[PDB]
Amino acid sequence: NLTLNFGPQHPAAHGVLRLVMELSGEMVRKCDPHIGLLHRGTEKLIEYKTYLQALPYFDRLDYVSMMCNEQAYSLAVEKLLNIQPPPRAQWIRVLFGEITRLLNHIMAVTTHALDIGAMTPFFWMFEEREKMFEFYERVSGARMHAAYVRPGGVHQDLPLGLMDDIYEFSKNFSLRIDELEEMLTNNRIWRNRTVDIGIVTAEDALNYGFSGVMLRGSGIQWDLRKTQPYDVYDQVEFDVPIGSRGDCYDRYLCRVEEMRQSIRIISQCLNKMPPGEIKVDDAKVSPPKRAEMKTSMESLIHHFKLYTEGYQVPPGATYTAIEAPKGEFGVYLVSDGSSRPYRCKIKAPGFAHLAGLDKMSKGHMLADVVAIIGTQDIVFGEVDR
Amino acid sequence: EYVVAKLDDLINWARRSSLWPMTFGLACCAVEMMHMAAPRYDMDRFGVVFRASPRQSDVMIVAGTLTNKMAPALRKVYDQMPEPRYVVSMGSCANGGGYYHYSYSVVRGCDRIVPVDIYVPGCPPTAEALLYGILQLQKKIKREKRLRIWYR
Amino acid sequence: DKYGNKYYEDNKQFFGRHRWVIYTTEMNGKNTFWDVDGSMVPPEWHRWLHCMT
Amino acid sequence: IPHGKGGRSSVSGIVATVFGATGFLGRYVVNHLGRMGSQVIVPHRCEPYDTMHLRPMGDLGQIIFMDWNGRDKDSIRRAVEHSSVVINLVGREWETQNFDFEDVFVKIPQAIAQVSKEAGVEKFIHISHLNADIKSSSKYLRSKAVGEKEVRETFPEATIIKPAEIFGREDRFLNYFANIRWFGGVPLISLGKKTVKQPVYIVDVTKGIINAIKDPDARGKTFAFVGPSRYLLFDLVQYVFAVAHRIGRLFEISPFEPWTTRDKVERIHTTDKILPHLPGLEDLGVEATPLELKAIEVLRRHRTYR
C-alpha cells in the first residue's frame, strides 16, 4: 500500500501536521498523524516565572483568542485568592469575552473554505475584520497579543468612545453574515461537498472526551455557558444551537447561529453597564494608581515590592475550565505558596479533537481528509498542552 | 562601459519587480501576514503575487518559532530554491527566538541554520512595518552583474 | 510642512486614504524620485499622519 | 588569551585574516575557524552576494567583511593592522582579458609582503604547489615557482605550505573528469604513463593549517603535503566511468570559462613526486585519508542507487 505523507506540503491551509496514510488503494482505513512541530518548552518554562510575569504566555497559546485566553487564567487564580472582581470589571470581560467568538467563528469558516478552495469568502470577510482590531489597539496595547486581563481584574478603563463605536459596528454586521448564507447554505455543491462526512454520533463521541461543537450540534445538549457561571453572564438571554445529525454539515450550522447569538449579547450587554472602578481595592493584588504612587508613603512600598516579587498565594490544588470558542480549557494550576508557581498543566482542545480523527476518517476518500480537519478548527501551537 | 552597464538597470530592476514568496506559517506571526493578504494593506499587485508552489520561489519567509523537529525540513526546502535567492525572517522569535529562548528545544536564532538578510523585529510586526521591510529589500538591490565579469 | 511634501488633506470622504503625502526630492542626499522608503517624514507628523490626533 | 570550551562563542586568542576565500579551498578552511571561535577578518573583492553562504559558520561578531582590490596598497593594509597571524591563498587559473596574470603571483604576494609584514604580524603562510618548478613547463605551472623564490626574499621565515593536488567536493581537477560527457572519453593523452599525482583529501588540508596556526616554531620550516597510497595509476580514469556508470559568472552565461585547449591540459600531467625530506604533513599531523572511501560522495550521476 502506498504510504504518502501529504502534510509537510505547504499546500495553503497551514503547512504543518505531517502524518502518514496507509491507504488501501483509494480508501484510507489507517491514519496515524505526527505532532510536535511546535513543542516550544512551555510547561517547563513557567516554573521559573512569577504570576504577573508569566501571564502573556497564556496569551500566545492560541492564534486567535486574546481575551478568552487570560480569561481562563485570572479566573483560575482569583479563586485561590478569595477575591470577587469589582462589578464594572465583569461587564468588560463578558464584552471582550463575547467579541473573540466573533474572531474564531469568522476564521473557522473562511480558512475551512480555503482548504476547500474557495477564494472570495476569504477576502470578503477579513476586510470587515479590520474594523475590529482598531478596538484592540485602542484599549490595550497592540495589534493582537495583549496582556490586558490581570489577576486584579481589568488593567485600565477603556477611553472615551468605544460605545458609539461598538453600537456602530454591531448594527451593520448581520448583513455580512447574510452574505455567506447566500454563499454557502443555499448552494448545492458545497452541500454536496459536505454531507454525511464524519458521522460520529455514538457514546464514543463522548468517551473520546470531546468538548463543544463536535458535540451538542451532534446531539447531546450540554454546554459550560449556562450550567456554570463565570461573571455577570447568566443575567443575559440567548439560546444555544443544536444541529440534526452527527456530521460536519450539522456541526457547521452551529457556527452560523452562534454568530447570531453574539450580536444579541453585545446588544444586551451595553444597556446594563454601571459606572464604577477598575481594579480590586485592597491593593495587595492590584497596583495602586499612578497619581498615588508619587505622593504617599504607603503607595510605594505596596508598589515597589509588588514588582520585585509577586503576590502571596495560599497552597492547595485547584482546577477550572471555561468556554474557549472551540472547546473547554482545562488549567490544573498547582500552587506552592510563594511568588513563583509550581506545575501549571494545561488541557487544550485538539488532544481529544484530533486523536478521534482515527475513528472519524476511515471508510472514506483521501480528498475527504483535508475537508475533515477544517471542521474541528484545529490550531497548532495550541496542541502544545 | 556606458553601453553594457545600462543593461543591468533592466535585469536588476526586473528581479526586484516580481517576487514570488513562500511563507512558513508556524506561529502567531503567520496570522498577521494573512491580514497583509487581506485587502486593507493589499499585498498582491504591488510587485508581488500571493502564495506559490515551493519550486518557483525567490524570497522565502520564516515566521514564528523553530523547533529541532523542523531544523532538517527547513534546510531541504532551502536547497531546492534557485540561485538568486534571499531570506527575510519576520517576527521576534526568528531573530534569537524571542523568548522561549532559554528552552530546551527551540532553535536559537534562525540564523545558525540559514543565512538571512533582513530582520524585522517584534511580536507581531503589525503588517505596517513589514511592507517597510519589503521596500527595504528592493532598496537593497542596487547590485550589478556587469562590472563583475567586466572587471574580473 | 515642511520641505515640498505638502500633506494633502482630502474632502473628508475617506479614512486611511484622506491624509496622503507626496515625496518629491532628496531629503538628506538621496536619489531624485525612485527610492523612497517612507521613513523620510519629520518626527512630528507621526502625531498626525498616523491619524493619532 | 583563551577562555572555556571552544565549542562556540569562545575567544581562543587568535585573530586571523584570510584573503581570497570565495573558491573551493578558502571557504572550507574558514569553516573551521568560526567553530573554535576567533576574530576572522575576511575581505572580499567585488562580491556582496557571493559570501552569503559563508556567514552561518561564525556565530556572532566573529566575522567581518571589507573591500579591497590588491593593486591598491592601503586596502590591503587598513584591514591587517590589527591582527596576529595572516595566511594567503589567492590566485586562480587562466589569464584575464584585463589583467596581467604574471605579477599576480609575484607582486600581489609582495603587496602583502609590504608594511603588512612590518606592522608586526607573525606566522605568515603562503601556499605553493608540489609541481611548481623553475623548469620550462609550464606558462602557469612555472611562474609559480618564480614567486616561490623572488618573494621568499621578503618574509625570511614563513613556513609556506606546499600542497599536492587536492580532491574534495567542488574542485576543478577531479570535476574535470566526469564533466566530459562527449562523443569520446579520451585520457591525457591516451597513455597511462605518468598518471597520477598525489590527491590529498580536503579535510587534511584544513587540518594542517589549524595545527600550524599555533604550532609553535613553524616559521621558515616549509612543509609538503603527502597524498594517498601511493603514487596512483591509470585506473583512476577507468574508476570514474565505472562507478559513475558512464558564483558570479554573468546573468545568462560567461563567454569564456572554458576547458582551455592551451597549457591547462599539461599542468596536471607533469606529476613530479618531489623531495621527501620535507617533513611536512605527517609531522604536522595527523592526516591519513584513502581515496576509495571518499569517492562515493563527490561523484554524482544518473543512477544514484545501484
Added chain:
Amino acid sequence: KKTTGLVGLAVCETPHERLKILYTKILDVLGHIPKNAAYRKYTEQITNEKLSMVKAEPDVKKLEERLQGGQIEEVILQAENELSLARKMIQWKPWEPLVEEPPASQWKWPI
C-alpha cells in the same frame, strides 16, 4: 416521534417491559453476591425504588418524570451498563479491607 433526540440510538422498541426485565435481570444476579458490603444495600435500594415507579403505568412521557434519566430509550443505557457493572463485582473483591497503606507521610501538601 421517529428521532430519539440524542443521535446514535433508536427507539427499539417497547417501553415498560424491556426495562421491567432488565431491572429484574439485575435483582436475580444481585442475590448472588455475599452480603457484607453495602453495595447491595444501596443498589437494591434504588432499583426497587425505580422498578416500583417503572411497573407499570402510562404513558412513556409520565415515566420520564420521577425517573431522572434522559429519554426512555436512554434510561435503558443507564442500567444497561449497570448489569455489566454488578456482574464484575463478583470477580474482584472490594468488600475485602484496605490494602497497601501509604508510608505514613505522603498526603501532606506543603512539601
Added chain:
Amino acid sequence: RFIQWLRNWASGRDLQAKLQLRYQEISKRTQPPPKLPVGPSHKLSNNYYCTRDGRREAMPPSIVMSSSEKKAVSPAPPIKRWELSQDEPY
C-alpha cells in the same frame, strides 16, 4: 444613476451598509479630559483593615479518611431540561 440600480437588482438592495466606514458618521474624535471615580471603600474612618480580609482563608477541610439507612445521595440534583427559544426553532 444607471450603474446604481444594477447593484440593487443583484443580491437585494442595501445602499447604506457599505463595507467602508471611511465616509461620514464614523466617530472621529472625543474632546474631554477623563477623571476616574474612586469608589469601593477607598475612604476613611470605617474603611479599615482586618474587616476587609481578602486573603487568609483556611485549609481544605479533611473528611473522614484512614489512619446507616442513607438515601444514596447524589452529588447534585439532576439537570432539568431546556426550553425551545420561541423565535424560530426550525
Added chain:
Amino acid sequence: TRPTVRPRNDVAHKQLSAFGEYVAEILPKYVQQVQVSCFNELEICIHPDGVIPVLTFLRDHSNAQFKSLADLTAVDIPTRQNRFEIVYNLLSLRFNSRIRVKTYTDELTPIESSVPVYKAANWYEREIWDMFGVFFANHPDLRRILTDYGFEGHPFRKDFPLSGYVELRYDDEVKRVVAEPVELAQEFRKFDLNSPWEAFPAYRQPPE
C-alpha cells in the same frame, strides 16, 4: 465580611461532603484518603492496585454517570520517597460535578492503564512515558509524541536543567546539521525572591 471578597456557599459544600462519604464506605479496599476542598472539590486518594475498577465503578452507575474524561496530567514531587503523582480529572455529565483521582506511584513500578476503561486516554497516557518514563501497562501502542527523536532525558522532571545539552547548529563541512554541546549567550540570571516572615497563619507547619 465585605464586598470584593468571594461569597462562598454551603449547599455544594454539603452535598460534596455527603456524596463522597459513602464512596469509601462501599469500597474500603482501595480508598485510603478522601478530602473535601473548601471550594467544592473532592480528592479520592487511591493506592494504584484499584486503578482500573474504581474508574470502572465510576464508569457506570445509576447515581453517578461520570463518563467525561477531561484531564490526565502528571505532577512530580521530589522528597516524597515515591516521587511522581498521576492525577485524573473526570466529569459527571448529568450532575455538573467535578472530582479528581490522585494516585501515587514510583518510577519503575508500572501502572495498569485505563485503555479498555476509557478511549480518550490514547494520546494522554503516552505523554507521561515520553516526559517521565512512567511505563503504563498493556497499552497497544507506546511511542514518542511531543518530543524530538534523539532525546534521552524525559525532561519534565526536576533534574533536567532548563536548557538541554543539545544546542543545534549547521556547518557546510559536508551537508549535515550536527549536534553540539550547549552554549548560551547569557546566563539566564536566576533571582532570589522568597521574602521571609510567613504571610500565612492557617497552613502553619508542625513546629517539630
Added chain:
Amino acid sequence: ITVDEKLDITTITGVPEEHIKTRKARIFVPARNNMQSGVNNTKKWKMEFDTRERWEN
C-alpha cells in the same frame, strides 16, 4: 501478584551524558541573609552544584 522481593541499591543512569562522575553536589541550610531578621527561609534543605568558569562575551 508476581511480587518477587529482591534487593538492589537503585542507581539509575543513561539519562544524563557524562556528568555523573564529574561533579559533586552540596546539601546545606540557607541561613539568614543578615541585612534583616526574618527566619522563614530556614526549615528547607537545598542543593547547588559545582561552579565553573564565567568569561566575557
Added chain:
Amino acid sequence: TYKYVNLREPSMDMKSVTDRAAQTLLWTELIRGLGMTLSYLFREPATINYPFEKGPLSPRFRGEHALRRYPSGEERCIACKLCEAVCPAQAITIEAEPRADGSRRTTRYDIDMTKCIYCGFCQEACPVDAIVEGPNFEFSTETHEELLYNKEKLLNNGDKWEAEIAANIQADYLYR
C-alpha cells in the same frame, strides 16, 4: 435552551416539487444567488497606498524604545532596576555606579530588541517614568549584530523626537 436547525421535512406534493425540479434542471439557483453576490464588484476598493497613505493608530500604541529626560538635560532614569526585574525576556541589563557628582547613574544599558517580547511592563514599572515605548515602527536593519541597542542609541533615539512622545503621555496619563 434549544434550537433545531436544519431540521425540516420536505413538502412532497404536486406543485412544490416543481420548485425543486426547476432548481436542478434549469439552474434558477446558483446564478440568481451566486452570480449576483459576486457582482457586487462596483464597490470602492479599500486599499491603503502604504508609502504614501497610512492607517489609523491609538495613543497607547507600543513600539520602539526610547529614554526621556527632564528640562534641560538630566537623564530622568535613576537606575532603580525595576524595569529589569519585570522584563519577561530579561532583555534589560544594567550596571550602575556612583558618578563623581554623587547621584547614581548608569554605565551599561541594554535592550535585547531581538529577545524583547514587548510586554511593555517597563513603561508601567518605572516610578520616575523613565523608559517609554515610543510609537514609531521604523525598523528592519540588515544584521543581527546591530539590533542590540546600547545606551548611546537610546538617548539619541529618545532625542530624535520628544514632542511625538510628550503629547501622547500627556493625553493618556489620567487613565493610568
Added chain:
Amino acid sequence: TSVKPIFSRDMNEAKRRVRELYRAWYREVPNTVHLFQLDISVKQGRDKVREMFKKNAHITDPRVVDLLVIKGKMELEETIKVWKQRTHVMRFFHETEAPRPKDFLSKFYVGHDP
C-alpha cells in the same frame, strides 16, 4: 522489593532479550546504509551496534535492563520505517565534534579544569 516487574522475572528472560533484537539490528545495518543514502562503510555500523550494548553491562538488577528493552525496541520503530530524515542516524556519530583531550598534561594548558 515490593514492586512488580515489567516483562522479565530474574535475569534469564532478561539476557535472552538483549541477544534477541541484536540480530534485528544486525540485518538492519546493511539494510539502511543503502536506504538513507549516506556513505560510510557498513562494518563501522556493526561496530557501533555492539559498542552500545557492551557499555551498559555493569547492571546486576532486573527491570532496569527491561526498561532499556522498551527503549531498545522503540528505536527500531523509526528505524525500519523512514522517520529519521538523514540526520538522526548521523547523530549517533560524534563526527564534526572536536576531540576531548582526556589527558592530564593536555587539560592543564587549556581550561579551568572542565
Added chain:
Amino acid sequence: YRKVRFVGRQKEVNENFAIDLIAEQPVSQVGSRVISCDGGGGALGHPRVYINLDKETKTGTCGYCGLQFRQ
C-alpha cells in the same frame, strides 16, 4: 584591540552629555526650612521629597530632582 569592528562604520556616538549639565542651572533659593520638589510638573517626574537646607546653603539636588537646590 577592539578597534577593527567599525572600519567603514563611522561609530555612531552620542553628542550631548548629562555627566555635567546640572552645573549650568540657576541654583534655586528660598530662605525657608523645608521645600517640596515635584519638579518637572505635578504627577510626573520625580516624587515628592522634603529637604533640609541649613548647612553650606544647599540641598544636594535631592538625588531625584537633579536640579541644584539651595538658598
